[PDB]
Amino acid sequence: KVFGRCELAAAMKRHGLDNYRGYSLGNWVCAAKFESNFNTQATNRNTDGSTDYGILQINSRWWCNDGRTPGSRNLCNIPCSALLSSDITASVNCAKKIVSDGNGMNAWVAWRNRCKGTDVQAWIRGCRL
Ligand SMILES: [Cl-]
Ligand SMILES: [Cl-]
Ligand SMILES: [Cl-]
Ligand SMILES: [Cl-]
Ligand SMILES: [Cl-]
Ligand code: NA
Ligand SMILES: [Rh+3]
Ligand SMILES: [Rh+3]
Ligand SMILES: [Rh+3]
Ligand SMILES: [Rh+3]
Ligand SMILES: [Rh+3]
Ligand SMILES: [Rh+3]
């Protein structure tokens, strides 16, 4: 599913991401934009052989099992395919664990490079939230 910007903002809010670990909703929407272009089916292979899955491009190296990432962990206790669902529950729940890991949203390199420090509120402008 390719979400609309405000549609995704609303789903993220309902699932408790607005101000989660201090990160306003626009931070999450901006991260999703640059990670996946709001596409829940997005996948991308990393150089180390791991793969990033879903709207927030969660990595199989640590967070989910895809059966093909040697030596990796599955800290969200989910198949990586769960992260590709039209329903964002699994991605949100796992994102909450990631952002709590010590590094905050710096865990998402696209957030650090493209969202951090910018006017992220723009990403939720106009939405009925
Ligand atoms: Cl957009
Ligand atoms: Cl915001
Ligand atoms: Cl594996
Ligand atoms: Cl599994
Ligand atoms: Cl933080
Ligand atoms: Na894994
Ligand atoms: Rh808010
Ligand atoms: Rh708020
Ligand atoms: Rh890499
Ligand atoms: Rh649901
Ligand atoms: Rh839902
Ligand atoms: Rh502004």
Swiss-Prot record:
Entry EC number(s): 3.2.1.17
Intrachain disulfide bonds: C6-C127, C30-C115, C64-C80, C76-C94
Record Pfam families: Lys
Catalytic activity: Hydrolysis of (1->4)-beta-linkages between N-acetylmuramic acid and N-acetyl-D-glucosamine residues in a peptidoglycan and between N-acetyl-D-glucosamine residues in chitodextrins
Example GO BP: defense response to Gram-negative bacterium
PROSITE patterns associated with the record: GLYCOSYL_HYDROL_F22_1, GLYCOSYL_HYDROL_F22_2
Main location: secreted
Residues binding substrate, per UniProt: D101
Extra remark beyond the main annotation: Lysozyme C is capable of both hydrolysis and transglycosylation; it also shows a slight esterase activity. It acts rapidly on both peptide-substituted and unsubstituted peptidoglycan, and slowly on chitin oligosaccharides.
The name this protein goes by in its record: Lysozyme C
Organism encoding this protein: Gallus gallus
Gene name in the database record: LYZ
